[PDB]
């Protein structure tokens, strides 16, 4: 149950919702610096 549901669905879902506050108190970014398109 944990491997197929909790680890696969429950845990990843929570990380996306909390965003940068998931890694609190470590200050992180939702996305990196907006990168330009490569040639």
């Amino acid at each position: 149950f944990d491997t197929l549901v909790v680890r696969s669905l429950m845990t990843p879902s929570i990380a996306t919702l909390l965003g940068r506050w998931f890694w609190w108190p470590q200050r992180v970014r939702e996305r990196p610096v907006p990168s330009k398109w490569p040639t």
């Binding site: 996305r31 990196p32 907006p34 990168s35 330009k36 398109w37 490569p38 040639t39």
Partner: protein
Amino acid sequence: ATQEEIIAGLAEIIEEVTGIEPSEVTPEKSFVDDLDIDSLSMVEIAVQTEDKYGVKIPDEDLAGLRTVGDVVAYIQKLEEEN
């Protein structure tokens, strides 16, 4: 950016999502038919672009988009609408 630059970034993303070679991807190719990319897979391409290039495409728009040329033009439309 330029249409050529748009293709290069998107083609790389498709390889991560599906495994299709970046050189294989052409504007003629269609995600649903040629690339055999379902609705779920096409979301991942939009998601990776959302984090990398900042272009987010919802479910409704992704369903409308059919081919690579359509998606490239759709993104280039946003670049045109600067």
